[PDB]
Amino acid sequence: FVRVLEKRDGTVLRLQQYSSGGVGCVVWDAAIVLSKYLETPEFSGDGAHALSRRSVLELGSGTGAVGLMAATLGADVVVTDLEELQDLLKMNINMNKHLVTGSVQAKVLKWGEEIEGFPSPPDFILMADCIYYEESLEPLLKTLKDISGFETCIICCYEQRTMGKNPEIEKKYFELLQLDFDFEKIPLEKHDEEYRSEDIHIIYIRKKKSKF
Ligand SMILES: C[S@@+](CC[C@H](N)C(=O)[O-])C[C@H]1O[C@@H](n2cnc3c(N)ncnc32)[C@H](O)[C@@H]1O
């Protein structure tokens, strides 16, 4: 009942998906793509967004897969989700703390609700498959605006769902996003050569600050 995700160095993250009492969350494909993206040279010492010793907030962590990966890369990570997912997050911190080279802790952060502030804006905010929640889009973007500063690197990874109401929900997300943020799509050629998909996008989001 463990989902496994292997790092570039052969070490292996292990993620439980069921917490006792109905509460649970699976590891989503977008979390695998973003996690393995964090292991590309882009987030190494000689890279554009070195992760080691930097502050990282993850929203909608679920199992914690992405934030845990960042913690095995030297970041000081806070993984967050709803109250009911805190037990699962703590279990997965326990299963992977032997691989953590930075730090990792879990906190409740329900989108739209103000929580324990950072002393200064995080260096990164990470999100995997956080966007198809129509009812929580304005809350999510409020949290993002409240926490990020002009230097925060916001990385948003999501699997594009092409059927149903999802195309519509996706457009509402971007229309709300553009009021306060810029974005830029990371070309597929920069994802992990193995763990990528034309259906799974990575976008860098930045708090807008125009000179005009
Ligand atoms: C599709 S899952 C993705 C989980 C994980 N990031 C991954 O990719 O494997 C979305 C996550 O967002 C969380 N979430 C949904 N609405 C939320 C809200 N209003 N506030 C905080 N978290 C929320 C869910 O509990 C769930 O863990």
UniProtKB/Swiss-Prot annotation:
Keyword field: Acetylation, Cytoplasm, Methyltransferase, Phosphoprotein, S-adenosyl-L-methionine, Transferase
Enzyme category, top tier: transferase
Phenotype for E58Q: Loss of methyltransferase activity
Binding site for S-adenosyl-L-methionine: W28, G60, S61, G62, D81, W111, A128, Y133
Subunit organization: Interacts with ALKBH6. Interacts with ASPSCR1 and UBXN6; interaction with ASPSCR1, but not with UBXN6, enhances VCP methylation.
Function: Protein N-lysine methyltransferase that specifically trimethylates 'Lys-315' of VCP/p97; this modification may decrease VCP ATPase activity.
GO cellular component: a single term: cytoplasm
Protein name in UniProt: Protein N-lysine methyltransferase METTL21D
Subcellular locations according to the entry: Cytoplasm
Organism for this UniProt entry: Homo sapiens
